Design a protein around this ligand. Structure first.
Ligand SMILES: [Mg+2]
Ligand SMILES: [Mg+2]
Ligand SMILES: [Mg+2]
Ligand SMILES: [Mg+2]
Lengths: 271, 271
């Protein structure tokens, strides 16, 4: 079935061993950064589940590399656009993660300069939806600047429940070097974060991209019209309604371009 | 050989028919539009060879879609960082391409905001090289904002002679939706421009990324330490000197990450 194909493409297991998934994903981070010769990792810490989880895995990987006599560091970076409404949850995430370094880059001045230029050149106001993707891409630029300056790889937080819906900005938070959370459903991520000892406030925090000025902290599920638990059931191979399977198989086909390198006439996936 | 392998991977011919190449690449643009229900394209026009060629192909594609009773448009966009030294060549390119719409977005104020913020937050000035990658990624954001506002796809200008060296910014000019130039060597791109009747200045000038404030209009070959004739000979299957194969095969391996989606533990290419 199409559910099985998608499950397999996205690397989703029906059941997991949380402790061994943590070990395997820490080990992937160590293997990849050692293979490449990079000095460690950078990651934007939003206060949300996925970056809290990826951040803690990164910090565990660099601690293990130093325990072996290697040189590795993790830079966590706060990337508010001006005042972030849930700053307290991001600060809670930093207290849990205990990153080597805690940096901050406020993207508001960059985003405002871009938006103001846009209206100057075109005569058109940049709309809230397009400005939200500007913010996500400006966060990518900030993380790659830190990484370029410091010799680090940029972590991404994509996982199967965001992959299957294409619920990320293309070349924004989709732009990253390596992905420790690939294959995890939303609830499986949550299980890892709880096993790592995070408080409920972090592992049960409502998912949000928080990109819009007109509707700050808008829930992902409001935008999707589908819950993460339904997504997660689909991806783990449980039975879902026809409405759920139909809507997710259409969104998956519609967003394949975000899960492939740019299309050329030699590619067969878009045909 | 690894030469033959890289030729296959990058889709390169030793031998092409220029009229057929143009037909195929225009037909790809039209097919991708028809399949996806897309409304046209946006592309940064630099005054260099590659964006000249991709831009004229895009304009031929949208003219053919409209001749067939469809709806499509092409927005060409100038993306100077303040005063661009070869603005005249970009204007010559626009005059040849004859785009439906020619827009402009000066990226300087955005890049200066970002760079001033970086130094305020970190106490470090961005290297000229890191700031040049900020410029390339800001150009990606500009094209995606125009595309997002207007309902268009973003063209990229990657081709085999840039792909083999990884000579593009990751999620900068590498970040695009579809690629009309895939598989072309540099001299093959020149041959297609000659068939389309381009002004010779645009294919005789030196290739340049022109990203650096301190070394403006730096030639690609100065940065690479290898010429386009050498790259093209390699890619076209011609017997080359061992020094060229050594240099290119090392760059190709080192930059594989730029030609794959972000790495996960379920990928083996990187190990
Ligand atoms: Mg997320
Ligand atoms: Mg979030
Ligand atoms: Mg080029
Ligand atoms: Mg150029």
């Amino acid at each position: 079935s199409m559910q099985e194909k998608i499950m397999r493409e996205l690397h989703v297991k029906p059941s997991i061993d949380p402790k061994q998934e943590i070990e395997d994903r820490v080990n992937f981070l160590k293997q990849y950064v050692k293979k490449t010769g990079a000095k460690g990792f950078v990651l934007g810490i939003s206060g949300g589940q996925d970056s809290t989880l990826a951040g803690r895995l990164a910090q565990l990987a660099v601690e293990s590399i130093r325990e072996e006599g290697g040189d590795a560091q993790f830079i966590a970076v706060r990337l508010p656009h001006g005042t972030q409404q849930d700053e307290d949850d991001a600060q809670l995430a930093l207290k849990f993660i205990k990153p080597d370094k805690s940096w901050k880059f406020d993207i508001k001045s960059t985003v405002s300069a871009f938006s103001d230029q846009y209206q100057q050149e075109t005569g058109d106001q940049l709309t809230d939806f397009n400005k939200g993707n500007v913010k996500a891409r400006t966060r990518m630029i900030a993380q790659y600047a830190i990484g370029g300056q410091e010799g680090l790889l940029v972590l991404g937080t994509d996982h199967a429940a965001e992959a299957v819906t294409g619920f990320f900005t293309k070349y924004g938070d989709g732009g990253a070097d390596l992905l420790p959370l690939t294959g995890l459903t939303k609830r499986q991520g949550r299980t890892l974060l709880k096993e790592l000892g995070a408080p409920e406030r972090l592992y049960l925090k409502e998912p949000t991209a928080d990109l819009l000025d007109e509707k700050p902290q808008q829930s992902d599920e409001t935008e999707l019209g589908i819950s993460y638990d339904e997504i997660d059931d689909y991806l783990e191979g449980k039975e879902v309604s026809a409405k759920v399977s139909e809507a997710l198989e259409k969104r998956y086909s519609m967003t394949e371009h975000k899960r492939q390198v740019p299309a050329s006439m030699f590619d067969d996936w878009w045909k």
